[PDB]
From TrEMBL:
This is Beta-lactamase. It comes from Acinetobacter baumannii. The keyword Ligase does not apply. PROSITE patterns: PROKAR_LIPOPROTEIN (PS51257). It comes from the Bacteria.
Length: 245
């Protein structure tokens, strides 16, 4: 339409400035990547994936028969950081709650040798998981850039990753987080607190009413004290600004 690129860029930058943090959002339309936000150089820097790795953990675990989508992972009765984690959950429920204890169990079922082979086969990020199967996506050594995250979201949204179609569809069903008019937003959040500085993610895609899918990845610096909902607020204001939703 009639709004200049200068004005779109200024508006999206201001969403990050108003939240008092530093970040980028990458949007892909077809093969074209557009970078917006207030710290554009973050686009090709590596950060831990944190809870965004649960997308790939779920695909690996389902494809290799380490879980089913209806299996209930029981809470072991020990105290958790968050009360909503102190309950029995399917992978889908654990995805929406970012319940790392469920995904650590799934990683342990997959085990280090298979985990490293699958992460290499999908060529996710720097592809390095090191020697600790239960925390490699949290504290290193696995890292990924925001460009690589939006390209992963593009691959999953279009069923292009090297898994069965059914496996990709099962995991995509776990990622629906919002519906706006007739658009649907599928995405996974992350907040890596085990590194310094802390990293915030929201990576996913918009499925528009006509069926087109527009992948995006938000990446920002988080600080103890911030609200996790700023990730969604920035992302939705940016997508609305560009007329994607």
């Amino acid at each position: 339409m009639h709004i200049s690129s200068q004005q779109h860029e200024k508006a999206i930058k201001s969403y990050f400035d108003e939240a008092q943090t530093q970040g980028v959002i990458i949007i892909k339309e077809g093969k074209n990547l557009s970078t917006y936000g207030n710290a554009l150089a973050r686009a090709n820097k590596e950060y831990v994936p944190a809870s965004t790795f649960k997308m790939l953990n779920a695909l690996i675990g389902l494809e290799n028969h380490k879980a089913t989508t209806n299996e209930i992972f029981k809470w072991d009765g020990k105290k958790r950081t968050y009360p909503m984690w102190e309950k029995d959950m399917t992978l889908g429920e654990a995805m929406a709650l970012s319940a790392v204890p469920v995904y650590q169990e799934l990683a342990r079922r997959t085990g280090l040798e298979l985990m490293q082979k699958e992460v290499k086969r999908v060529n996710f990020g720097n592809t390095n998981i090191g020697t600790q199967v239960d925390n490699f996506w949290l504290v290193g050594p696995l890292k990924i850039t925001p460009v690589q995250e939006v390209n992963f979201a593009d691959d999953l949204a279009h069923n292009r990753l090297p898994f069965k179609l059914e496996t990709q569809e099962e995991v995509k069903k776990m990622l629906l987080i919002k519906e706006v008019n007739g658009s649907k937003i599928y995405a996974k959040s992350g907040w890596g607190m085990g590194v310094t500085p802390q990293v915030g993610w929201l990576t996913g895609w918009v499925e528009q009413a006509n069926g087109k899918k527009i992948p995006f990845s938000l990446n920002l610096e988080m600080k103890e004290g911030m609200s996790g909902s700023i990730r969604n607020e920035i992302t939705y204001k940016s997508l609305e600004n560009l007329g994607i939703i």
